[PDB]
């Protein structure tokens, strides 16, 4: 017999002691090696309730990524309130590695294997595992990158869709590549992101169709963010240690859903910023100018964060804007199928 419980997890990874890359360095002293022979036991005739929105595994992962970033990033200036810290800011090696989350003795992780499980409610295909799959701690906004895919249909996740303050996570079932480049090609901060418009617009139309099912067949319209810091109004992510800000207006083009020119490549204008707002909470940091040469990163778009416009208007349509409420929601997007229980 078991019951829902929280406990201190530990992490496992394939980090290497010879690697200078900062995730590897953190995971070398903060995690144990990955289980060579992972065991998963499918529990016959067991129904179990999950709640991805109230899952302490998420909070624990959050604290790890905060500690990782705190020990790794080296901005020229750290700013907090009135406190200013100038320090050396050498260019670092930055590339997230998969981190596994594991239970200690007396506990186990239950895992929902229902293919269209939305994150809350009963799960009828439950297995037990010692460790999660490897999750890359990718810090990004608007788009979820390099994550896992929904196995069957596109899944809409929300604690409550009627509640406009609750984050919506759209889980894709097919990846769309996003190809970002700061060319060696003169504005050194000017960059761009290329997306296959045919692939993307097909997926985005699929997303709108799934949103329709959850919102009483109302018309689904996208709009750009109404306000916020640049990390919010733009697709924000890091590539090779550099902080990228990409304009996603073209990525949510209502004309290309439901006619001429939407098949070509979508090019998003981007900027690399030296001065950023810290996602850990309150704080500003300034980094050195971008590294020389071509800066390039290809990522998989595997999810979208959305916010729905609140308030009451005679509604033919619901309006959604890219961006979610919280960095922890990124961890939720991967941890949704897991729950810790205590063995009795």
């Amino acid at each position: 017999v078991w019951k829902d419980a929280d406990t201190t997890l530990f992490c496992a990874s394939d980090a290497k002691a010879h690697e200078t890359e900062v995730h590897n360095v953190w995971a070398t002293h903060a995690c144990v090696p990955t289980d060579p022979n992972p065991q998963e036991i499918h529990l016959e005739n067991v129904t179990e309730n999950f709640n991805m929105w109230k899952n302490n595994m998420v909070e624990q992962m959050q604290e790890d990524v905060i500690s990782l970033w705190d020990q790794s990033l080296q901005p020229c200036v750290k700013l907090t309130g009135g406190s200013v810290i100038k320090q050396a800011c050498p260019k670092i090696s930055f590339d997230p590695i998969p981190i596994h989350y594991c239970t200690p003795a007396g506990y186990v992780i239950l895992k929902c294997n229902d293919k269209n499980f939305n994150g809350t409610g009963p799960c009828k295909n439950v297995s037990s595992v010692q460790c999660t799959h490897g999750i890359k701690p990718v810090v990004s906004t608007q788009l979820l990158l390099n994550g896992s895919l929904a196995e069957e249909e596109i899944i809409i996740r929300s604690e409550n869709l009627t509640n406009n303050a609750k984050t919506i996570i759209v889980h894709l079932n097919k990846s769309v590549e996003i190809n970002c480049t700061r060319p060696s090609n003169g504005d050194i901060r000017k960059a761009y992101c290329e997306i296959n418009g045919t692939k993307w617009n097909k997926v985005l139309k699929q997303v709108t169709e799934k949103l329709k099912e959850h919102f009483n067949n109302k018309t689904i319209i996208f709009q750009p963010p109404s306000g916020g810091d640049l990390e919010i109004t733009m697709h924000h992510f890091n590539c090779r240690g550099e902080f990228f800000y990409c304009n996603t207006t073209q990525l949510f083009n209502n004309t290309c859903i439901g006619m001429k020119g939407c098949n070509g490549t979508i090019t998003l204008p981007c900027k690399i910023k030296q001065i950023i707002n810290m996602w850990q909470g309150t704080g500003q940091a300034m980094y050195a100018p971008p590294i020389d040469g071509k800066i390039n990163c290809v990522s998989n778009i595997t999810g979208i964060l959305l916010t729905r416009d609140g308030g009451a208007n005679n509604t033919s349509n619901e309006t959604f804007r890219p961006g979610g409420g919280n960095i922890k929601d990124n961890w939720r997007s991967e941890l949704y199928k897991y729950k810790v229980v205590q063995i009795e």
């Epitope: 906004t141 409550n160 009627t162 509640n163 406009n164 303050a165 963010p225 109404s226 306000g227 916020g228 810091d229 990390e231 919010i232 707002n277 909470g281 309150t282 916010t307 416009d309 609140g310 308030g311 009451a312 961006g323 409420g325 919280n326």
Partner: antibody, heavy 121, light 105 residues
Framework: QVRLVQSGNQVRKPGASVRISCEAS????????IHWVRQVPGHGLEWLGW??????????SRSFQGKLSMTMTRDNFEETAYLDLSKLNPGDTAVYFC????????????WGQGTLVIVSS | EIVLTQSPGTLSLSPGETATLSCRTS???????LAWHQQRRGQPPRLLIY???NRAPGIPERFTGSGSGTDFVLTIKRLERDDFAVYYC?????FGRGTRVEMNR
Amino acid sequence: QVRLVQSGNQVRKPGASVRISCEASGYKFIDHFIHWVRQVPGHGLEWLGWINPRGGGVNYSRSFQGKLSMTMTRDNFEETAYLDLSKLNPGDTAVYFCARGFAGYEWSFIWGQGTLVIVSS
Amino acid sequence: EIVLTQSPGTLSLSPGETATLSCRTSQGILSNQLAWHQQRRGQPPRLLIYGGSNRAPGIPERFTGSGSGTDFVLTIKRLERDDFAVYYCQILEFFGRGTRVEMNR
């Protein structure tokens, strides 16, 4: 105790702007949305929108789109939220409240004391 | 939109009596999604009940929130002078039009 203290009553001509502040205290500012609500004298409460201090993201009520030009901002260091109303019309004469949900209940509003804005020629 | 209907619009009761205020919703809601507020004239609103049935700190025990599904109730026992006020229910971003509790004599 959670407390929201707003700036003082204002008088504006049509076409002008007003910026209302909402100073929070008694809690960790960045962990709670700030909402704004208006109440025309003699009428009921109408939600305007919220701001998320973590990033400054906002949600503006569809009911006021095209009818009220508003901008919500915040200063996390000063733990203050701001409501900026531009291009005011006489119909914008109202009391404006900021609010914060009770802990664990984002829509169970705890209220600021309100700011009266008069718009008149 | 969740349509909230408060009833009655006005109550006239003697001090000492019990006020029963209703908030009815067009669709079933969750209890946590509802709040009651009190507003005395010329004053800001004050949170009374959060999450449908939880009395806010400092709120007197004579104020009690109950209800479920589509019908929520605020009951005020032993009405005192300061209780004669307007009461609003809130569900998510939506507010009822209010019930005014007035003093009978």
